[PDB]
Every structure is written in structure tokens, then in C-alpha cells.
Structure 1
Amino acid sequence: VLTVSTVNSQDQVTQKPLRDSVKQALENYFAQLNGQDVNDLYELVLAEVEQPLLDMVMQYTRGNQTRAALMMGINRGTLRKKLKKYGMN
């Protein structure tokens, strides 16, 4: 589940699991620090992951929150809270 697709030069399509991009993304972040200290990292990662998720869902549910919240599997309230967090409603 949850995998981006890629090709090689041989024109074969292969599925690279999403967690691999996340590890690279975290490590490229650290690579871009020197001296700096790392805090509130969880908030960083979640913004990048929740915005596309909420956007993607709202698209398929056609803006219906009760169905968005049912597909995602969280409370209507949490949903309402997060959409605000990202200025999405």
C-alpha cells in the first residue's frame, strides 16, 4: 500500500514505497542544517503529509465533510479542526 511508481532505463515500471521518500526527505533536511538544532520535527512532517491527504480526499468526496471524515476515519470535529489548520475551509 502507499507507493509511488518509477521507471528504469529499461522502460519497466516499478513501485517504490512511500516510506522510502519520507526517509530521504528527512535525511535531506538534516543535510541542509549545520549548527542548527532540530525541534518540532513532527509538526514539520505532518504538514507535508496532511495537506495533500485532505486535499485529495475533499476532491473525491466533492467537498462533503461527512464523507471525507468517514473515508479518512476520523471525527468530523478533528476534520473540521485540521481543515482550519491548513486554511482549507
Structure 2
Amino acid sequence: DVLTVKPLRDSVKQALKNYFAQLVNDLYELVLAEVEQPLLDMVMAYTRGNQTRAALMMGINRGTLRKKLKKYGMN
């Protein structure tokens, strides 16, 4: 509905199609990593690095936000 570029899921679908053609046991994490890092980047940019505002926007507590940032080496 709100995530378009048309909807995002179509870009994900096409990316997976190209990937499979180029062929694994970490596909979920592989995709999550490619989706979470940019999400964290954008939300942090939007709140100017304010973790509380970012967490609240995403609907997750600050602790989980910081865990994700750390996981991707963004701390």
C-alpha cells in the first residue's frame, strides 16, 4: 500500500528471481540483512540519530533498536 518505488515486494520478488538464476542455507538472514540495514539507515537519518525517536517510529523498544544497529556494525 504505502511502500512503493511498483510496490516494494515486487522489487524483492525480482531480486530473488535474479539470485536463484545465479545459483544455500542463510537466505532469511541474507534478505533480512539487505532489508534491515537500509531501514535502520533511513529511520536514523530521519530522526537525525535520535534512537528513542527511531525506535518509537519503528514500533520496537530502544534496546532492540541498539541491538540491530550493533548487529550490522552501525553503532
Over the aligned positions, Cα root-mean-square deviation in angstroms equals 3.9
* 1:12 CA drift (Å): 19
Q: Which has the larger radius of gyration?
A: 1
- Normalized per residue, the structure richer in helix is 2
Tell me the matched-pair count.
Answer: 75
3-state SS of 2:5 partner: strand
Runs of 4+ in 1 over 3 A off after TM superposition: 11-15
Higher relative contact order (CA 8 A, sep 6+): 2
Q: TM-score, normalised by structure 2?
A: 0.90
Q: TM-score, normalised by structure 1?
A: 0.76
Q: Deviations over 1:17-48 (max 9, x none)?
A: 11001011111111001xxxx21110000011
Gaps of 5+ in 1: 1-10
Gaps of 5+ in 2: none
- Normalized per residue, the structure richer in strand is 1
State percent identity of aligned pairs. 93
